[PDB]
Amino acid sequence: ESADLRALAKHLYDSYIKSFPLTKAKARAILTGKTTDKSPFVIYDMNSLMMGEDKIKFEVAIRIFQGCQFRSVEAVQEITEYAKSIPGFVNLDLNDQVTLLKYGVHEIIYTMLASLMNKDGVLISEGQGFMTREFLKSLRKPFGDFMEPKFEFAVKFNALELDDSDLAIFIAVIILSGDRPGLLNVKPIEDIQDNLLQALELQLKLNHPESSQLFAKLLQKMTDLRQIVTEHVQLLQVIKKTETDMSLHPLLQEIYK
Amino acid sequence: ESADLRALAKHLYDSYIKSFPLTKAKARAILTGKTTDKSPFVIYDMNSLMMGKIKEVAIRIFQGCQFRSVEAVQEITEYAKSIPGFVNLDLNDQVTLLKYGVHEIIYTMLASLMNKDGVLISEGQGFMTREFLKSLKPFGDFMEPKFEFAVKFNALELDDSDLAIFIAVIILSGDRPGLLNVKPIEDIQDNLLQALELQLKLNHPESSQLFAKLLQKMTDLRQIVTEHVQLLQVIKKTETDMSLHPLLQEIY
Ligand SMILES: O=C(O)[C@H](Oc1cccc(C(F)(F)F)c1)c1ccc(Cl)cc1
Numbered sequence: 001e002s003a004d005l006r007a008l009a010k011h012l013y014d015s016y017i018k019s020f021p022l023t024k025a026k027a028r029a030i031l032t033g034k035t036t037d038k039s040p041f042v043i044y045d046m047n048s049l050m051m052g053e054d055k056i057k058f059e060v061a062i063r064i065f066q067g068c069q070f071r072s073v074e075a076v077q078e079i080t081e082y083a084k085s086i087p088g089f090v091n092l093d094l095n096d097q098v099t100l101l102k103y104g105v106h107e108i109i110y111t112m113l114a115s116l117m118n119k120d121g122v123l124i125s126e127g128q129g130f131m132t133r134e135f136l137k138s139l140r141k142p143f144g145d146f147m148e149p150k151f152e153f154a155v156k157f158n159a160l161e162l163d164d165s166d167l168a169i170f171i172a173v174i175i176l177s178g179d180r181p182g183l184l185n186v187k188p189i190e191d192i193q194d195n196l197l198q199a200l201e202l203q204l205k206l207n208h209p210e211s212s213q214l215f216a217k218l219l220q221k222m223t224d225l226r227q228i229v230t231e232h233v234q235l236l237q238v239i240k241k242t243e244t245d246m247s248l249h250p251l252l253q254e255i256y257k
Numbered sequence: 258e259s260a261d262l263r264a265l266a267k268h269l270y271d272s273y274i275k276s277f278p279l280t281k282a283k284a285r286a287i288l289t290g291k292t293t294d295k296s297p298f299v300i301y302d303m304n305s306l307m308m309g310k311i312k313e314v315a316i317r318i319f320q321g322c323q324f325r326s327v328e329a330v331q332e333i334t335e336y337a338k339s340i341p342g343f344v345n346l347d348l349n350d351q352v353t354l355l356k357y358g359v360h361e362i363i364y365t366m367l368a369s370l371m372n373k374d375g376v377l378i379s380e381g382q383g384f385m386t387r388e389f390l391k392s393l394k395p396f397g398d399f400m401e402p403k404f405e406f407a408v409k410f411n412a413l414e415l416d417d418s419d420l421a422i423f424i425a426v427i428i429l430s431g432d433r434p435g436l437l438n439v440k441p442i443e444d445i446q447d448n449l450l451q452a453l454e455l456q457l458k459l460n461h462p463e464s465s466q467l468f469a470k471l472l473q474k475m476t477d478l479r480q481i482v483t484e485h486v487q488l489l490q491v492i493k494k495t496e497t498d499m500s501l502h503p504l505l506q507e508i509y
Pocket residue numbers: 318319321322323325326329363364366367370376377378379380381400
């Protein structure tokens with residue numbers, strides 16, 4: 001009944017708060033004035049870049065990309081911590097635990113990145129910086145294009161006006177897919193996702209009573225995530241040929257495929 | 258209220274029955290609700306092919322699939338016309354919705370013709386095995402992704418009355434690129450989504466979160482379609498060079 005599903009919802013939200021520093025709520029408070037204390041240094045061209053390094057401490061195109069990838073790997077750690085708290089997750093076959101994270105983290109990374117973005121740019125270094133979209137778009141060689149798809153998603157995704165309590169459940173749903181390739185035991189995964197889907201449905205009805213079919217519309221966005229991730233990986237294998245200079249982390253090229 | 262959404266559901270189902278000759282129900286009766294009036298002819302290797310009565314083989318098989326797709330597109334177009342509100346949209350947008358919708362719909366309906374072992378062909382008269390397809394240079398792999406989708410998709414045990422609404426949902430996607438007026442499209446999809454939700458609760462009271470699970474499958478359709486196109490342009494360099502058919506590849 002309703003009551004159990006709210007409990008699951010609260011539990012998740014708490015794990016989310018504990019696993020992710022930098023909530024959407026915090027992000028939105030930074031992006032929308034809201035503060036003297038919280039206001040970000042803005043990077044929009046080469047020079048502001050250099051100041052940033054002096055103030056909001058951490059080829060340019062290479063450094064920026066590598067930094068993105070470094071932050072991704074510590075996001076994966078946060079996501080992994082979160083997953084552990086999803087009821088039932090740790091009781092799964094460990095092979096499957098790994099498979100769910102393997103295929104889930106990117107989709108989740110892009111979901112959360114949307115909270116850090118608006119149409120004009122994206123927060124960086126724990127929200128202290130903000131790097132414009134145009135400045136990203138202008139980078140050398142094939143780097144001038146890695147972030148754009150993610151901005152397009154973000155703008156659409158953020159139109160749903162979800163809050164952290166909505167996102168915590170949606171993220172759990174993503175992890176517990178069961179369509180992931182190479183899963184040994186799909187049934188227990190679906191059973192868990194089933195509950196998550198109910199928790200989410202109820203959560204959205206309560207938290208967005210005015211919003212017709214938000215549940216549906218949110219699930220439809222998973223199509224968009226998947227396309228982003230496949231674009232990213234294919235982009236990646238180019239910035240690996242050409243940039244044989246480039247290296248990837250022990251959490252990453254394992255995930256990639 | 259419920260009542261209006263059932264009306265929309267019935268209306269759609271009726272249009273579906275009129276627009277598509279071979280229903281899933283019929284297909285299922287042929288594939289296995291057997292003891293039938295007529296079993297399909299089975300193609301499992303080169304020879305059964307030839308009798309199939311009813312120019313590299315791999316080429317002909319692919320081209321045939323494409324010819325059948327094009328007449329499916331006509332059926333789908335007829336169906337769309339009956340979706341309430343569709344014909345009232347900007348015509349540019351009507352075209353855009355069909356342009357980007359038909360493939361997703363084609364793979365959805367193809368699933369009704371498939372099981373893990375193969376696929377019905379020529380109005381259900383034939384059946385071509387998966388292993389025979391799998392064995393065809395790059396042709397031996399075009400159908401495999403679609404079998405994987407089909408098996409998963411068909412696990413949802415949807416019937417024609419479920420599929421009719423789902424298909425409408427697909428068409429009325431306002432994330433298609435180049436749409437002029439997204440709002441009316443979403444408004445229509447919104448209703449369709451309700452009709453579907455109710456439809457699945459009533460037609461599958463046993464199955465928890467079927468709505469959710471069905472929408473999740475759209476992720477799979479979209480990947481399939483992008484794989485297909487990104488396979489297709491490789492066909493462009495095998496053997497369609499010839500020009501004993503300028504009007505055909507024009508049509509197809
Ligand atoms: O010939 C057929 O009956 C069938 O055609 C198709 C092809 C695509 C789509 C559809 C349908 F409209 F039924 F979805 C039928 C078919 C299916 C697979 C292949 Cl490899 C060749 C031909």
